[model samples]
Target: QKTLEVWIMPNSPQPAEDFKALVAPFEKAHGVEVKVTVLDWGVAWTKITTAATSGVGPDLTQLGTTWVGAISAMGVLEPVDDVLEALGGEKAYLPAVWRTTRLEGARQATAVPWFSELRAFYYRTDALKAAGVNPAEMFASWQGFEAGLARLKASSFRDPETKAPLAPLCTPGKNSWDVLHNAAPWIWGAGGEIVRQAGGRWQSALNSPESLEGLYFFLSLAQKGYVPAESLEKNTAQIEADFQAGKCAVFASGPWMIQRAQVPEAKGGFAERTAAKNLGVAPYPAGPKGRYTFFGGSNLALFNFSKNKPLAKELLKYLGGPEAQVRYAQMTGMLPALRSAWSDPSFQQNPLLRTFIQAAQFGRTYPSLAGWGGVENLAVQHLGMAWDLVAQGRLTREALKDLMDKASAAINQALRH
Candidate 1:
């Protein structure tokens, strides 16, 4: 008998209980013990990277979809193409989800998609109805969506106590590297490209006119006071709290929000609050060009240095199998990457999940370059700076142009490295 150790993201929905339950069958069948380590989102990547760099990590681990390019670049993950082949390849999972696990331009599978989440508008249903805004029409485009926000703010939208300016929409900030990453939908919808890789060379498109337009539009919502001004310093938890408190009519978040969004301990338990009863969710509004949404989730990978590679791979199969996929999705509140899992009646009954399914159809992958991580970090930093300048009234039309020039140069330099 052998032990297969695994590390998964901390704060994952009821992971300890789920893992314990998941491995019972595996242990009984294979006679292998399993140990699970859960790390916070902030630590998940760093821990994996550190261990991989030192040649000492778990036999099998769960990693974020975005980290695929980075870890694969470092050459720390075992390609799962063989395992995938054994599992019946692409036909076994959702077409889109299976594609997400394979790095573009790579011949082998660097990771196995376990679950996925898509960005969508999470809003108060009653607020929309009270404001007389048609839910169907609210997400036609960014402009139309902003107009809806304006109306919602003017009508029944009000601060819980201060009664000052309130808004119908909010976006995460502070610990919001994802705000920039996930903002891809709005940018791509507006015909923006961060960088285009061709023939082994990368070109910087972060400051391109199309990209800047999308960035500006997002900032304008904050500038116009559709979201809380204090949101500039808020984290994901704070954003959820604010939403639960009815401080905003809508917020852009993923299934991760569903936990607190539904918890009664929070400011108005999502399911109990009348004001939040109509918590409407939809794919993000389109830009002038088309529609796009950020598609992200976690993947299961085997560390290069693990002592129990075979057993680890077996564990991977357990998690990726059709039955386990559905169980994991139900346990984590994450969308199962396996298409077959959705055949269960519970999955078919979800209407809100329809948006995720729809948005995922048009979802775009993050850049696949080894340096793409740095590129994303730099792009988000530049965007935050530009947005801050605009908010302070320091960025005039001229300032916006100058900032773009500076941002473009920095992005180009980063790509060069």
Candidate 2:
């Protein structure tokens, strides 16, 4: 009769009440009392990091996929090598997501993949049809997408309140994380790597011609006025709100927004007016190489210092198993990391979920090298500067090149250390 403490971020699709029911059977069968504490995502990482350093934290907790390498380097996470094999090895989970669990330069997995987050274009069907653009044809290629933006911008579309031209795209401009997530797919689709290991050493490729091409495309959307000038100060949530208000025709986000869009307006949600019959989703447009989107999500990990190590591992196994993974998706509308869950009829029949599942097949993640956090920190600073310059109409080709070079050098220096 031991008590097991678990920490989950409040962002889960499964409501806290539903989560309790999901775990009740396990608690009963194992004869252990389970306590689940939900933390706000905004500060969860800081809290987890502090707890890790103090050698005091929950027995089990949810972790961002990007954090696996950094946390594993701290030696705070228990290796799940055997658990991975027991669950059917690498083939059991989506290949892209399974890689997130591995610690760089190590053979053991640091955690168990729980779910995935894939980005796509969410648009207003009414807006596009009114502009005479075919959704499938327009969003299938980068060229077509850009052309469609121009058409939407030129049409009679206007924000209801401001009477100003409606923005063709709604995306974050200042928030570094949102900017990176929205921009990375374009860079990858243009045939570039943010960072790559070459000759046994990590190096930055952000300044390469292909990478710059992608960066320029992202900048042009703002510079050309296809998106609102206010985007330079907006975050993802603000952009989503604009989308919900019918102020923008297209917005890029994950499945969570789709769920939020379905909320009734009377309940302080936008479903009735904005999403009832107007919402549509499609895979990200393809670039020269292929279509790519940010591949992100969280995983469940056991703490190395847990006193009840055996019991914690058992719980981890259950949570990461197919049953719990499917239930989690059914509750949250998030994609499951386990490949077997894709066969579930609910995913196959729902067009919205199906779009995400297909997109997941082509998803990619940031390089998982040690010290990648520093690289990302430096990249965000330089990229944010570039965005500001472009927004102010002050960036030149030379200035853009210099900014990329400086960012790449800073990242490379961190990698060498």
Candidate 3:
């Protein structure tokens, strides 16, 4: 039997096992063995870059939507424009996610939109009720959000499980890997752009007044102690661990934890240990200028080096189809990229999932330009420092201006390279 090699990231609780099962039906239909390898997130960038450069590695691999611009420029991917067109055309998938199918201003589709990972306010209904806050109205705007935090803290309520006062909110700081992603929506919602086009070139807008305002408001949560100062010392792991253990009343996170909240405790899930039954989700609180959330996902791409282009297309076709996309999302607890999947009973039946269908529309994405990685890297450096200063009580508007201006200067230089 012929073997078809595939590389996927750890998107599910058990990616290797779940991905293998997702492709099992296709394997049987074609009478071939579809081998699945799960890549480590930390090592995936260099590894995939090497594969594109050396013409080696899996026949088809998953690409972070943001990576398409850089990787497609290498001319190592088989364009899937026609493949996706056949799947149903422009309206088939989430518009924001579909926008990542190609590089900015490019003619070829370099990848297939797989699934979307979106941020929503994950809160305990019981916790919100006890705080005397209306969940919907509390997240309506920046003012309402802050007021809700104040009331929650004033309620003097403690989680039954941890016997600790519930944290009003939680966010990662300098020690985290996703510091910039955590801050992206704030900048966008405040009518600020990360990078703006001007005079036929891109320049960093991180130092703009609006961007500064958003940055100040976000960090002020920690400064004012609405978000525990100790949270700034922890990474996403412990932050989520505390949230899942019922020590935190509200936080912004992805949908994967939603499904984990349903599994039995005997299987190491939070069903019994947390406020799993009283959970509710909603979009992020609106800023003064706009309402937005972090939006990005993974895509499946066929490697040009693969001798089996014909077979690779078949797999991409099957995966992009509603059947595979919907089933895969159910297993991973992430939102499916395809719009049709939302109509499926699994999605239609869950009110929690409905929040996704409604909220996914307001999401914004990162720039899909070559060398964007350099921009993100540069921005993270300055942003990380601002976070440090915020934690140290020295991050005034003047100090933040210096940091953001430096990051903007560097990002502008990289964009021109």
Candidate 4:
């Protein structure tokens, strides 16, 4: 009997305990031992990257979508078409979900799409009614979004849990990657592209005039204090806590947040305010260009050094299968990666997920090059720095151009490598 060692990030929005419950049955059915190790978010990627280079991570690990291309490019990951074929071809899975794992013309299932977390606006329905606002009509455009913020501010409302006045929006800026990922959807919705391939060479459009307009508008929100200044320093979890406490009128986040919003410390609890009634998720609002959003989620990957590669593949097959996927979506409250899962009872019951399903269909992935790690880090750092300067009323349009130019050059340089 072989034991499969699995590495998973500990603090993800999904309930790992429940996920493990699902995994336990798989282990029993397969007669294999499953050992799960939880790693700190800060060290998980670094540790896994180190293990990949040195030939030592777990047999299977949960990796973010951004990493699929990089890891697959490294040539250590095994293809899962065999697993998919055994389960069912493209017909068994969602075309969009399967497409995520294919990179550079290869059907390498180096990563399997698990639960996804796309950007959406979660607001308080009761609060909106109190302010004489209709949630649906309030956020149709950037102008409408700003007005709704003003309405929420004018209403003499305090934090649901702490009794503090709510800011208009809440965003997690602590993790550099989070900021980079979240900002792209707004830019895309605003008609901007960071980089695109042309004639086998990567060209950058990040510094174009169109991109600049989008970037500036995005920064303006932060400058106007639509989002709490302190949030720029808090991790995703901390930001969730703030939103749950009702310190912010709206939270721009993903389905994973559904669980965290239920914590006992949260005001109105999950049932009373968060998911049951207070929650109102909308597509990333349309920008000057149109509605664009970034899509991301965890994917299952098999490490080269893991001894239980075959069994891990089996687990992946089961999880990605329609029946298991439906259960996972319902249990985790995360959107299903497969389109067919949308019609599942679990998704039908939660109208909020429909928005995500729509977003996934059209949203784009950020740069998939291996060097994206460094490029994205720099991009987020520049955005934060630029935001600070703009907040002080010192940033110029030229500064935006400069930052975008630098990001484009850096990203293009990586794509070339």
* Model 3, runs deviating above 4 Å: 174-177, 265-268
Off by over 4 Å in 2: 13-18, 31-33, 39-42, 158-165, 265-269
RMSD of each: 2.9, 2.6, 2.0, 2.8
- How much does candidate 4 score in TM-score? 0.90
Q: Which model is ahead, 3 or 4, in terms of TM-score? A: 3
Tell me model 4's lDDT, rounded to 2 decimals: 0.69
Off by over 4 Å in 4: 10-16, 40-42, 262-277, 358-361
Model 4 agreement with the true structure over 300-345: per-residue lDDT tens digits: 8887666777788998887777777777766666776665677876
Give the range of the ten consecutive residues with the poorest summed lDDT in model 3: 172-181
**Model 3 clash pairs?**
none
Error of 2 at 73 (Å): 1.6
Query: Model 1's lDDT to the true fold?
Result: 0.72
Residue 260, candidate 4: alpha-carbon lDDT: 46
What residue pairs are clashing in model 1? 10-39, 125-278
| Candidate 2 residue 189 C-alpha distance from true site, Å | 1.9
Better of 1 and 4 by lDDT: 1
Candidate 1: stretches off by over 4 Å: 94-96, 158-166, 198-200, 256-276, 401-417
lDDT of each: 0.72, 0.79, 0.82, 0.69
Ranking by lDDT: 3, 2, 1, 4
**How would you encode candidate 1's per-residue C-alpha lDDT over 176-244 as one tens digit per residue?**
556576567767888987776656778676667888787777777777777666776565667776776
